[PDB]
Subunit: 303 residues, 4 copies
Amino acid sequence: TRQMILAVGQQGPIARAETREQVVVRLLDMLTKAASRGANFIVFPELALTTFFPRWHFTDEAELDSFYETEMPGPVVRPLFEKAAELGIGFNLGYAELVVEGGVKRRFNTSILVDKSGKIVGKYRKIHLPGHKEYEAYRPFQHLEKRYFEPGDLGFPVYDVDAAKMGMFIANDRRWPEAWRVMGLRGAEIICGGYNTPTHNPPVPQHDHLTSFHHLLSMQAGSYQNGAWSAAAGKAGMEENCMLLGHSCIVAPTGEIVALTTTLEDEVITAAVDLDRCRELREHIFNFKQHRQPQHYGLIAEL
Amino acid sequence: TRQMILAVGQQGPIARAETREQVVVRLLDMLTKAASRGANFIVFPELALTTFFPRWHFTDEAELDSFYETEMPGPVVRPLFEKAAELGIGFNLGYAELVVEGGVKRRFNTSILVDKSGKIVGKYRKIHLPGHKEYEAYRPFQHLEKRYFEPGDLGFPVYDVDAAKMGMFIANDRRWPEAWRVMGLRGAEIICGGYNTPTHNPPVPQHDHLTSFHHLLSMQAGSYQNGAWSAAAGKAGMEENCMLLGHSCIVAPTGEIVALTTTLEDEVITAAVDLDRCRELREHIFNFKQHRQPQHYGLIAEL
Amino acid sequence: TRQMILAVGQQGPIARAETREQVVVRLLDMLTKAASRGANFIVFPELALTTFFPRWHFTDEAELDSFYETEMPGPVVRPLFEKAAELGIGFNLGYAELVVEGGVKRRFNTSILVDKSGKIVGKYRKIHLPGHKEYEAYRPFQHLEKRYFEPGDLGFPVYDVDAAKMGMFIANDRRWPEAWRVMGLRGAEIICGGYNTPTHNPPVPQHDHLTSFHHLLSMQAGSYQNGAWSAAAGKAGMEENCMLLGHSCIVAPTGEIVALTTTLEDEVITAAVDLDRCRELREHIFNFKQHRQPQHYGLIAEL
Amino acid sequence: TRQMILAVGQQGPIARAETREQVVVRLLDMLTKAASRGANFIVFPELALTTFFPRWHFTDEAELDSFYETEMPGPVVRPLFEKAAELGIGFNLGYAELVVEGGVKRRFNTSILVDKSGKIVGKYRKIHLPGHKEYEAYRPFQHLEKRYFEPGDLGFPVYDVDAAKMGMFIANDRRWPEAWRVMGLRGAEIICGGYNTPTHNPPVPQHDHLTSFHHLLSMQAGSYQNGAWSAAAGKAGMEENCMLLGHSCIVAPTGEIVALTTTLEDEVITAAVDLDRCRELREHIFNFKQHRQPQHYGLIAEL
């Protein structure tokens, strides 16, 4: 087939004390409603199981570890996979991944793709870690991802998810044309991921009123230039006193926004997706093999 | 500190019978108007000295050649350079370049940067030739760029132009993130060029109503993701029965559009440009050294 | 209730020879798919039963009359109402209305609202007739609505349609703030209608590339300023050699576009609608009774 | 024929302790810069002579009064008028007006138009006072306009300013279609004003990320639907712990944005304005005499 209905499950805030059981309840509800609307795949936010902990400066490692998943899924998250298989609707779930190798802990900002059978068919680990590295007393909230996470070691892969070639990005990655391009070259038909974007940036507050503009601009250009459908799921609202951006969206391979959220709570949007639409770009104006000149792009790949 | 007034000189149509002498009078008029408005640099369109000849299939090589420049500047175009030096305003001029080397008549879609002293500071030759190589019957008007030009051989250079790092793109180039990124990586503070974009696309007519959108989307995303000011000068209006896109523009490093033409005739727009404003992006969210992961972009440079 | 799922059924072209039976087939299909996606109301285009005949200069009245409905519904259109009642989904259908009063024929560009029970609960007749009045030989297609239709005599009413207060506009009306305002004052929660908008305007072709911009601008401002959800259903594509605008849409009371079509064929888009969202505007920034100053708006109502 | 260069002088913050003498130096600087760029008229912000005092509840009437002008111009503001006449550039200046009539201390949020001769050509008093009348505890900062001003008593006039029909609006007014329409009906070719728009809205915080969108949406739709050029000068930046919206702009009669500020500081933008361009709308799609149906708008003018 080449037809499907894609959905985005935007999340409202997640409190520090809110349990994964409670979140799964909210997650289940969205997946159920999306399915009731015909969707066979739903995109969830970056780190969708917990509050955005990278905003705090940690000192107690046990504290930090508590925000990561040591298995996927665990007993508490399993019900999501079961419901996924039951209703026949895949999903993109973001979470904090903790792996212990030879006694050494490895941390990643992760996202996985589950097909409509309820099976994990791909994973991606955040490659572009935003923010600063050291505590900055002036900021009303920190952004210490470079500390609590290592740069993804999977590159930007593209997986087959129920007849659709899908690629993954996580939050900040969406702002990097390289991320989109690599997956575009790998033939992605859909490029999705979630995000936690504060509408306020302490180091550059003069860009606060452009938060939506910059986010939407990234999704539209990315889709357009790679002739791919895209979807972004944000966790929005006032979370732990930090206002997070909404405007979760689904974009056509022409860069046109076909669905957009308007609340700052859990919200489901859907859009019919024709995987062959990609050809309007990828076989003409952006027919890579016929127009690209990689012999002159070398600087982009230099270390 | 490090400020200037950038101008864009959009051209209205140029008829097949319109002479270069006549076109130069028009270019002189806009350059002068720009200077009277405080502009230190003005961006002119792609192939700004003649009608867009790539729309017709030529059988007479003598006739095809007439549309190319063998000198830059020649006696006819020279007056433009003199005015530039006189009024202290540089410019970016696009034209068809014909040069014989090693027994080969090389044809380039070229653009040059002249500083406010009237001196040619640097050149660029279109690398992404859009369209087709052979006459196509299903088209109401041709776009034989692949036939009339060979891909530029200068890469995507960035030159110093009156203490401003400027990079050049030509029409279709603006749609490629690779072009923008290479120059962004070279430190371009201003990225500019001209264009001839028919509002009708024979191959994919269902995108006709998106001509403007796709054009501005490319300029905005390019500027933003590279923290560079940008400007695009189009040649618009009904030229030889083919409508060309207007919306010539100047964009800030934030991707915000600061100036936009509203007519389809010769028109000058201007904007105050602060070269330090690039830092808001290039020293933060898009601080390449601190964020880019080139080890993962290799596929982009693969042949 | 205050929750519902609104849908728009965009139509591809309708040939002059295409029969109403064939159109109903297309109409039925969209209403069925919209219902399968949870929608309880679907908006259809202006004059959705026929080709846009106002583009031709008629001479044979029998010819002209053939494009109008003498009853609503007739045997051929009835199946739409039946399916509507069956699936529990109302709709907004536009059509050419022919009424014979005392031997005198009355013509209107009409639209009706059918609730989920399949009953007509309101009607509106186009008040702002666009175009010219006399044949203009230069135009590749005419726009003679002022001739084939009389100005609506129902004003801009607002009806109760299954727990939702809905108002109607037809094509061009959407460009007039007065139309939106009157219905906004009447408490409309949803303001919908369809349209036939050629992407080319013979008298002002310099606005062709702005066709989408102007259309979307009208829907967004209208919704925002009246704190109402809105939806526009277009009949798009190359119809009888005239390219018609797509970008059918659904807008939130904040002016945000929550759903947008991307093809130029029959296409269904949906969006969840919370009738209470209207309060965010109508009870605050646009709390009419608390902020408006009608004693100074007199000029708007003067004849 | 009938052309001019319109400028907008956006203000950065104005501290409570900042004196009028100091503010005037800033206004003189932008007016001069505008003239050097060929501008014949510059639009300044709402209450451009002091900080936005409506944000604080005052108990001392003497202190509240200090923020109002009793003369226009007074010795301190006079220098601005002299420069205007000298450089031949008119302006639109907003300030708090205090006038005693019939034993009443009348307080208006005012704006005046001065021609390029330094002569006050006309006045306007804000008719739509946003905010509230009594101190509200739930607000982080007040907006007591309803308390500190009474609705203007001059209606929405249109004056001749150096052969240009200009109408005035003040901040919140721009959001009301009635204000735009009244002046549109009066034949305004340019509709302009200033504003103080906090990017945070206590009553409806879920619209904070839409502050820019709503602002530009209002300017664009107003211009387009009335076929009028427009311009809005905002006072932006972090003023007294409250962030104010930037994005000061100039819009063509088509609703297209031709110039837009990018900083949150004092900034001058300009645009070439062709007063005849209004005809493209006012003599066609929006030819009022030929299209408006006032007999159906009565509710708009009802008290």
